[PDB]
């Protein structure tokens, strides 16, 4: 399902074209303007460990999820992949350990060296 497929078609987003961060839209945004580093950022989310063992919502939150682009307030593969999308798309990502909690994890919820997969809606952002 879904985390294979984006093994086997997404795009590698990262600089260093280490598959740290593969890419498939799932539904297309609006608009050519994607979020500049600072910006405010408001989305929708459903991630799990790619064992697809642990399964967790913004939804669950009942109300969109925010932070500020590239100012390392979420996993680095947030930071570079929310970069990449316009309002409305919605993607999915599959996260290698080393764009999300590494070596060390992120105990009781990340084990050491996870993969992560996300669907993410982009819904709005603004300039700080
Ligand atoms: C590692 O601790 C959590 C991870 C996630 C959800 C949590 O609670 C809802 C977590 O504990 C408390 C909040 C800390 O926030 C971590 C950081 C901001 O999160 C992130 O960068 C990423 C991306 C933004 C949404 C949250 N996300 C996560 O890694 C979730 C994961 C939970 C289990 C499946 C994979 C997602």
Redesign the pocket.
């Given at each position: 399902g879904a985390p294979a497929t984006v093994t086997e078609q997404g795009e590698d987003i990262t600089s260093k074209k280490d598959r740290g961060v593969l890419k498939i839209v799932k539904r297309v945004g609006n608009g050519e303007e994607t979020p500049m580093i600072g910006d405010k950022v408001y989305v929708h989310?459903k991630?799990?460990?790619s064992n697809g063992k642990?399964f967790?919502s913004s939804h669950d939150r009942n109300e969109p999820?925010v932070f500020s682009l590239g100012k390392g307030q979420?996993?680095k593969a947030?930071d570079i992949g929310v970069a990449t999308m316009k309002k409305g798309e919605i993607a999915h990502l599959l996260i290698k350990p080393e764009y999300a909690?590494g070596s060390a994890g992120?105990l009781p919820?990340?084990p050491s060296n996870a993969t992560?997969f996300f669907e993410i809606e982009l819904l709005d952002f603004k300039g700080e």
């Open positions: 989310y991630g799990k460990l642990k967790d999820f979420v996993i947030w909690y992120s919820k990340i992560l």
